[PDB]
Design a protein around this motif. Structure first.
Motif, PDB file in Angstrom:
ATOM      1  N   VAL A 161     -72.166 -83.473 -38.311  1.00 56.93           N
ATOM      2  CA  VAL A 161     -73.288 -84.098 -38.994  1.00 56.93           C
ATOM      3  C   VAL A 161     -73.102 -83.792 -40.467  1.00 56.93           C
ATOM      4  O   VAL A 161     -73.068 -82.628 -40.865  1.00 56.93           O
ATOM      5  N   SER A 162     -72.947 -84.834 -41.274  1.00 55.74           N
ATOM      6  CA  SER A 162     -72.746 -84.637 -42.697  1.00 55.74           C
ATOM      7  C   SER A 162     -73.819 -85.287 -43.549  1.00 55.74           C
ATOM      8  O   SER A 162     -74.389 -86.324 -43.195  1.00 55.74           O
ATOM      9  N   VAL A 163     -74.062 -84.671 -44.694  1.00 54.87           N
ATOM     10  CA  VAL A 163     -75.052 -85.138 -45.633  1.00 54.87           C
ATOM     11  C   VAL A 163     -74.446 -85.065 -47.045  1.00 54.87           C
ATOM     12  O   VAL A 163     -73.670 -84.159 -47.366  1.00 54.87           O
ATOM     13  N   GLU A 164     -74.740 -86.068 -47.860  1.00 58.23           N
ATOM     14  CA  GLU A 164     -74.220 -86.115 -49.217  1.00 58.23           C
ATOM     15  C   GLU A 164     -75.277 -85.636 -50.205  1.00 58.23           C
ATOM     16  O   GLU A 164     -76.414 -86.110 -50.188  1.00 58.23           O
ATOM     17  N   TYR A 165     -74.899 -84.677 -51.045  1.00 56.64           N
ATOM     18  CA  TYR A 165     -75.799 -84.129 -52.059  1.00 56.64           C
ATOM     19  C   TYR A 165     -75.764 -84.934 -53.351  1.00 56.64           C
ATOM     20  O   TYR A 165     -74.693 -85.289 -53.843  1.00 56.64           O
ATOM     21  N   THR A 166     -76.940 -85.192 -53.912  1.00 61.99           N
ATOM     22  CA  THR A 166     -77.056 -85.951 -55.151  1.00 61.99           C
ATOM     23  C   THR A 166     -78.025 -85.290 -56.144  1.00 61.99           C
ATOM     24  O   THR A 166     -78.993 -84.647 -55.737  1.00 61.99           O
ATOM     25  N   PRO A 216     -63.894 -84.147 -42.198  1.00 60.87           N
ATOM     26  CA  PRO A 216     -64.484 -84.847 -43.348  1.00 60.87           C
ATOM     27  C   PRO A 216     -64.035 -84.209 -44.677  1.00 60.87           C
ATOM     28  O   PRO A 216     -63.899 -82.985 -44.779  1.00 60.87           O
ATOM     29  N   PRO A 217     -63.800 -85.034 -45.711  1.00 59.51           N
ATOM     30  CA  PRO A 217     -63.354 -84.532 -47.019  1.00 59.51           C
ATOM     31  C   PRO A 217     -64.358 -83.706 -47.849  1.00 59.51           C
ATOM     32  O   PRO A 217     -64.858 -84.151 -48.889  1.00 59.51           O
ATOM     33  N   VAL A 218     -64.631 -82.493 -47.391  1.00 56.59           N
ATOM     34  CA  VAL A 218     -65.527 -81.589 -48.104  1.00 56.59           C
ATOM     35  C   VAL A 218     -64.898 -81.307 -49.480  1.00 56.59           C
ATOM     36  O   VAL A 218     -65.580 -81.139 -50.486  1.00 56.59           O
ATOM     37  N   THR A 219     -63.573 -81.318 -49.499  1.00 55.28           N
ATOM     38  CA  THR A 219     -62.771 -81.119 -50.693  1.00 55.28           C
ATOM     39  C   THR A 219     -61.811 -82.317 -50.702  1.00 55.28           C
ATOM     40  O   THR A 219     -61.628 -82.968 -49.668  1.00 55.28           O
ATOM     41  N   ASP A 220     -61.229 -82.629 -51.856  1.00 55.84           N
ATOM     42  CA  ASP A 220     -60.298 -83.755 -51.966  1.00 55.84           C
ATOM     43  C   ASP A 220     -58.811 -83.362 -52.033  1.00 55.84           C
ATOM     44  O   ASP A 220     -57.960 -84.202 -52.310  1.00 55.84           O
ATOM     45  N   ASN A 221     -58.503 -82.091 -51.807  1.00 54.53           N
ATOM     46  CA  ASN A 221     -57.124 -81.607 -51.845  1.00 54.53           C
ATOM     47  C   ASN A 221     -56.961 -80.485 -50.822  1.00 54.53           C
ATOM     48  O   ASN A 221     -57.770 -79.563 -50.774  1.00 54.53           O
ATOM     49  N   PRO A 222     -55.904 -80.548 -49.996  1.00 61.22           N
ATOM     50  CA  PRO A 222     -55.652 -79.526 -48.977  1.00 61.22           C
ATOM     51  C   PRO A 222     -55.541 -78.086 -49.483  1.00 61.22           C
ATOM     52  O   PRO A 222     -55.721 -77.149 -48.707  1.00 61.22           O
ATOM     53  N   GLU A 223     -55.288 -77.900 -50.775  1.00 59.18           N
ATOM     54  CA  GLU A 223     -55.184 -76.547 -51.318  1.00 59.18           C
ATOM     55  C   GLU A 223     -56.475 -76.036 -51.950  1.00 59.18           C
ATOM     56  O   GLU A 223     -56.533 -74.888 -52.397  1.00 59.18           O
ATOM     57  N   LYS A 224     -57.498 -76.880 -52.037  1.00 62.57           N
ATOM     58  CA  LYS A 224     -58.763 -76.424 -52.604  1.00 62.57           C
ATOM     59  C   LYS A 224     -59.578 -75.737 -51.515  1.00 62.57           C
ATOM     60  O   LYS A 224     -59.549 -76.138 -50.349  1.00 62.57           O
ATOM     61  N   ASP A 225     -60.292 -74.687 -51.894  1.00 65.80           N
ATOM     62  CA  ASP A 225     -61.073 -73.932 -50.930  1.00 65.80           C
ATOM     63  C   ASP A 225     -62.436 -74.446 -50.502  1.00 65.80           C
ATOM     64  O   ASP A 225     -63.082 -75.272 -51.165  1.00 65.80           O
TER      65      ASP A 225
END
Length: 202
Positions: free
Chosen positions: A61-66, A152-161
């Motif tokens: 379950v995902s939610v987008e923060y704005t 889901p893309p919580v981050t946009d790069n596999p090396e970002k934490d």
């Protein structure tokens, strides 16, 4: 390698007890049972390793923060927990024995998620002194055993934490259960800037 300090992880646990605790109270209000939540674990993880932390077919379950905060907030619940909550929302005792789920059950958990995260965001906003808006929670089933699926893309790069937060939930008359939340370390650092500013305002 690790960007999150112990202080930032401690904040995660503290705000998690308050925010998710608020989500538990409204959930408890909807149902007629006492519900308590605890945060035993807070783990820093590279984005590329998140998927390997979970197995089997689960519900995310995902939610987008704005405005105030920007980013993806993901909740990972297992089939059994989802079924217990659905049954509860539909009137049952919650003590079922199945992993079977359908659009109707998923619809009932989505409403529970709606009310819960709405409270969490509201609690977080009051806590940090900033207005945070959330998109309606998108519920979907993800098969972690399928090699082609991606978390889901919580981050946009596999090396970002990222931070993987563990929540322990105790519902009256039922056995303990747990679920996970994963937010970017970017978002955590952002929450820390808001958090430290008012820890200084003694």
């Amino acid at each position: 390698a690790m960007v999150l300090t112990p202080e930032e992880k401690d904040m995660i646990g503290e705000i998690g007890n308050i925010a998710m605790g608020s989500a538990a109270t409204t959930l408890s209000m909807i149902l007629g049972r006492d519900i308590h939540i605890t945060v035993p674990t807070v783990r820093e993880e590279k984005m590329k390793n998140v998927k390997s932390d979970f197995s089997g077919e689960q519900v995310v379950v995902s939610v987008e923060y704005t405005e105030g905060l920007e980013g993806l907030n993901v909740l990972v619940l297992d089939k059994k927990l989802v079924a217990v909550i659905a049954d509860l929302m539909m009137g049952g005792s919650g003590e079922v024995e199945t992993e079977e789920l359908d659009e109707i059950k998923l619809s009932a958990v989505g409403e529970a998620m709606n009310q819960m995260m709405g409270s969490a965001a509201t609690s977080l906003s009051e806590l940090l002194g900033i207005t945070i808006n959330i998109s309606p929670p998108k519920v979907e089933i993800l098969n972690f055993d399928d090699p082609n699926t991606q978390f889901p893309p919580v981050t946009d790069n596999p090396e970002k934490d990222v931070a993987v937060v563990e929540f322990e939930m105790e519902i009256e008359g039922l056995p303990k259960s747990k679920f996970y939340q994963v937010i970017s370390a970017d978002l955590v650092k952002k929450m820390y800037e808001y958090f430290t500013k008012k820890q200084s305002e003694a």
